[PDB]
Amino acid sequence: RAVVEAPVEHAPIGKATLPSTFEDSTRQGWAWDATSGVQSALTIKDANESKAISWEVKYPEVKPVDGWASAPRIMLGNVNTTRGNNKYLTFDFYLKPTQASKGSLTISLAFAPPSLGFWAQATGDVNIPLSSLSKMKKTTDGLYHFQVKYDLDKINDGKVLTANTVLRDITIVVADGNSDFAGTMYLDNIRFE
């Protein structure tokens, strides 16, 4: 299936690049998956003094049965990278809510290794409770700043990502956990470490 809307003005696609820093004002290869529930513009915005890829999202009040149907699902296609000797993939993730008081966001990471059926998903989903936010200190520009880490030795289905396993695509999903989130999201410094 494909989720479609009228043409949208994204920032320039650029070329797939890791670490993804967005400092060339391009998306560095990041784009919505064709199945992403969010298809609105991906632009490059300042976040916490650095250029970051960004989008707006307000989850539906009526929650879909499939937990990813309404989710931003952003993908770096055909990067064809490998983890090397890195234990983690990590990135800076920022929120600027206009509304956030209940439920949570569940952030998942997956890859598409051609040697592993084109899907390998990190086991360590990261949950951010929206009630935690009002107590968290914001950045100078009013964002909540997370640095999200995924242990690449914890992958579902007994699949193992070796140092040399080709990862054709990288996917990040920010799923709605029965939440009332509305506002802007941003990613930066997507990298292995």
Ligand X SMILES: OC[C@H]1O[C@@H](O[C@H]2[C@H](O)[C@@H](O)[C@H](O[C@H]3[C@H](O)[C@@H](O)[C@H](O[C@H]4[C@H](O)[C@@H](O)[C@H](O[C@H]5[C@H](O)[C@@H](O)[C@H](O)O[C@@H]5CO)O[C@@H]4CO)O[C@@H]3CO)O[C@@H]2CO)[C@H](O)[C@@H](O)[C@@H]1O
Q: Least Å distance between CB 75 and ligand X? A: 8
Identify what 146 binds: Ca ion, ligand X, none; CB under 5 to 8 Å per kind: none
3-state secondary structure of 168: coil
Choice from 76, 81, 188, 190 touching Ca ion (CB under 5 A): 188
Q: Is 51 in the site for Ca ion (CB under 5 A)?
A: yes
Q: Is 22 in the site for Ca ion (CB under 5 A)?
A: yes
Q: Is 27 in the site for Ca ion (CB under 5 A)?
A: no
Q: Least Å distance between CB 142 and ligand X? A: 28
R_g over Cα of the chain: 16
* Per-residue CA distances from 103 to 43, 96, 162, 172, 192 (Å): 27, 16, 35, 19, 29
**Cα–Cα distance between 178 and 60 in angstroms, integer?**
10
Output 50 or 98, the one with its CB closest to Ca ion: 50
Summarize as ranges the residues that interact with ligand X (CB under 6 A). Answer: 35, 66-68, 106, 108, 112, 117-119, 121, 125, 175
All residues at 6 or more sequence positions from 73 whose CB lies less than 8 Å from its CB, including other chains: 32, 33, 35, 36, 37, 38, 171, 172, 173
- Are 88 and 170 in contact by the 8 Å Cβ rule? The answer is no
Could you tell me which stretch among 73-81, 112-120, 155-163, 181-189 binds Ca ion (CB under 5 A)?
Answer: 181-189
Q: Is 169 in the site for Ca ion (CB under 5 A)?
A: no
